[PDB]
Structure 1
């Protein structure tokens, strides 16, 4: 994930990218299950269909 815009604007655009990577890769330090993975996929689908629509 490269971000090259300016001296500081590159990091301003990289803020969202870093947030996305942190939220995506945070699930490799605790217990999880594949059925629960599909469960949480459905849950986030419902969340984005109700709030983000």
Structure 2
């Protein structure tokens, strides 16, 4: 990806995007069954919803 800022203000958004990209990429490091992957999707959705409201 790409990110640009003058000298300093980049860091916070860089951390946010880097953590999001890492959490997305962790899904393609070791394979699981497709049904288990769907169940994991459901569980992540429930976790996010209950933490988001």
TM-score normalised per structure 2: 0.77
- Structure 1 runs of 4+ aligned residues shifted over 3 Å read none
Q: Which runs of 5+ in 1 are unaligned?
A: none
Q: Which runs of 5+ in 2 are unaligned?
A: none
Give the number of aligned pairs: 53
CA RMSD of aligned residues (A): 1.5
Specify which structure has the bigger relative contact order, considering alpha-carbon pairs within 8 angstroms and separated by 6 or more residues.
1
Q: Which has the higher helix share?
A: 2
TM-score normalised per structure 1: 0.77
Name whichever of 38-47 and 3-12 sits farther off. 3-12
